[model samples]
Target: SPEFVNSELTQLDEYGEWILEQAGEDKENLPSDVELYKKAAELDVLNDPKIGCVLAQCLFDEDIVNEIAEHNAFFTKILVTPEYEKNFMGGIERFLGLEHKDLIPLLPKILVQLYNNDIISEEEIMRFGTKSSKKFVPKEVSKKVRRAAKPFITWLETAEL
Candidate 1:
């Protein structure tokens, strides 16, 4: 599980690279920990602001809150894994202050998981939901639509091949 274990130290994939690209770094040579990772992050892409997410994550992991408090945008997206999703949602709530009513409208895509690597898939599923009474995070409706989302959820529950 080195990929997962060293994930933090390692630069993410296309998506990661893209994030840096959007920020204006050399897409062919990202610069954040670019100096350290050498040619790994992008393999051969350029560097840019996309590193903000990973850089922020690295900084967050280190607990340098003040340094991170300044960067308003997230460079990296969440993987939609359990903990990742919870933190993603929690972060959204904490950072952007989204309530069920606010996010429900985005629906399935917004609630679906995104591929961490651009080489993978491009999705933005929010994996974690409040557990009190409602388990499914309704995208843009009331407590009534959760039942409607069940069919969608079942469709997504595919076993890894």
Candidate 2:
């Protein structure tokens, strides 16, 4: 569907630009996350793997789930904490500059959908959170996501969390 593909690609690009900026020095550590997501896209796990990994990884560190899920439930919208929301918005800023700009808000949701479809393994998903950046994410949220991501990280180093 052109609607799905185009919209998704648009969101993906927004996510990509946003993440590349967010990744900064840490972008160097994302080769695996980036590659796996690209493969996921080729497998149709994402309409645009580049964008999906870029964006999904943001949430991995943010762990703004309770708020995000709550926002998704009440407003049917995704919102990170107002403070982190700025960094979150930075990614969508690119989305706003795109043609199918309307898809930006859905980028996070779309990336998750791609993950579900891709069967990319929990380890892979968690890997997206790894970074060389020093405490780049918010402490509380990062802690939670890291704890959740621990298994994945542990598995990478030891085959189990």
Candidate 3:
């Protein structure tokens, strides 16, 4: 039932709504998106596929970008880890490719955001741009992602020299 699972997983808005509800419950001590992400990681649900969509959905919120930048290290912990890194990136790719293709244009900006926060290094960005493996990411989707991220990669190359 891969199709069924994919269909269920792509409902990012529903997951976003759930995140909003969870964030609202602790009004006095409202949990940040990073905290929510960490909670999911702690629960070992970060690999659930929907979790990536939820994180990606959070990024679409106007305020969440700044929050993520401020708490960048938490994200770095997840992203740099050997085990979680690929799944996390794959999840983002899957969500963007399937549910928000239009927003793919913003991929470069997201890369810049992560770079500015020191969450991802320049080498990692280069590797991402050049990634050809379709193990977790589909070929077509990976092509689009690399294309979208091409400008940033170019900028990085230029900046280095």
Candidate 4:
């Protein structure tokens, strides 16, 4: 289903751009468009500082997270390049302290990757994992959702320090 997943990703990319465009347009008429916007009020979230960047980051993270969540051989194919990981961890101190609510589904994978790369410590993982799992850990969510997240736990268990 890579093609199907890619199709979804493609649609998500289009939606991200549309959000940016909506941010630039007249807000008063948004309700009339109704499709992507849903309504003028909903589009207001895009006005937040750097939300567009967050959306881009979140979307990129989603594809990888979805891959890991599946835990298939395909997961092995989705490598996290050092440069890409570094960019993801650029504001490390700030990010480590932040909850990254949008990226919650990928927290275990993200934490394990950071640990595997020596970017974050076990202690830090403990703190973030504790908080994030309370919200959407694979174990606590639906079977499909849990399936999407559980492999990261296995990865962490076997991952070398």
Candidate 5:
């Protein structure tokens, strides 16, 4: 004789209904794509710099890379816009500064992934190396994280020219 197994589930209650209603209302003022991507980065536990390259690699793997190609112009427009660029840098700063200090070295790797995937441009990367970009991060952590990015920025200067 086979044993019977029972699975239990609960129906949505008033709090559940409130949660759904709140999400529906909040969806109207959605954040930009990069902001959403930053949120995903924050949620990921793969924060060690040594392994963070995998996070960058897997995040922009073939499927999303192709999707980015499909909407190439749209991505170009948003990524190059000063407002969005600031937000993108700010997102990176927050991700590195808040609770992931060890992941600061992952900045360049992440930038390279975005650059190679065509989600970001050389001009944007250069712009990010400037003093103006310091506005996004706190004064204390900015220098250290920027120092972490030096090697990649150095390569960009020599290789691209």
Candidate 6:
């Protein structure tokens, strides 16, 4: 399950501190988070839906999300590509369907950018309405998601895109 994958990854990351303490390493000498993320991306782990969901959660981490949110120009070119779209929509689902308050702000900008470039569609946006059309997040969680995603939701209803 996605939740299990998320929890396990989070647990392992949390346990990293213990491993470092036991190893007596200099904290500053440890690999940067970006290096860690890239290492994880290289593994087959993130290709699985549940595991990918966990990787998506990492994007919600404040450091990277801010960087991603700022880089709209980069996505404008990349997002329209089919491969990038698949990966993005996968990440979007995890955040838009789950418990992530910090991720809310990035949603509108991301969707708007992709929508402007014809990288996304209305059906793709609404497909999650039916439980198990994708993952089944709780109703309240979905509601929170809906609220956070209000801009995209409004666009979906009005823009005909």
Per-model lDDT: 0.33, 0.37, 0.60, 0.37, 0.49, 0.48
Q: Summarize candidate 6's per-residue lDDT along 1-161 as a digit string, tens digits.
A: 22345454565444333334432322334344444444445543333334333434443343433334443443453344444445455566665555456666776666665555555555555443222323335556655554555756666777699
Worst 10 residues of 3 by lDDT: 1-10
lDDT of 1 at 96: 21
RMSD of 1: 13.9
Which window of ten consecutive residues has the lowest lDDT sum in model 2?
71-80
Question: What residue runs in model 6 are displaced by over 4 Å at the alpha carbon?
Answer: 1-42, 62-66, 69-99, 102-106, 114-122, 128-136
In candidate 6, list every pair of residues with a backbone clash: none
**Judged by lDDT against the true structure, how good is candidate 4?**
0.37
Query: How far out, in Å, is residue 102 in model 4?
Result: 6.2
Best by lDDT: 3
Residue 115 of model 2 has an lDDT of: 39
Model 4 residue 56 lDDT score = 26
Model 3: how far residue 107 lies from native, Å: 1.0
Instruction: Compose the digit string of candidate 3's lDDT tens values, residues 1-161.
Output: 22244344444444555565665532334467577666665556555544543555444433433444665655665454533444445655665676667767777887788788766567666777778548556798788876788898889988999
| Residue range 1-161, candidate 4, lDDT tens digits | 22344443455444555544554432332212234334213444322323322332332323443322332222122223433222323222122224344544565565555566554445444443333332222433323233333556555556699
Model 5 alpha-carbon drift over 4 Å, by segment: 1-80, 132-134
Off by over 4 Å in 4: 1-103, 131-161
Q: List candidate 2 stretches off by more than 4 Å.
A: 1-50, 53-137
Ranking by TM-score: 3, 5, 6, 1, 4, 2
Query: Which candidate should be chosen as best, given TM-score against the real structure?
Result: 3
Candidate 1 has an lDDT of: 0.33
User: Which 10 consecutive residues of model 6 have the lowest summed lDDT?
Assistant: 127-136
Alpha-carbon TM-score of each model against the true structure = 0.27, 0.23, 0.62, 0.25, 0.49, 0.45
Tens digit of per-residue lDDT, candidate 5, span 1-161 = 32254221111122222223433432343334454334434433212221222222222322332323343443464344544554555556655665567767677776776678656567767776654445656777777776777778898999999
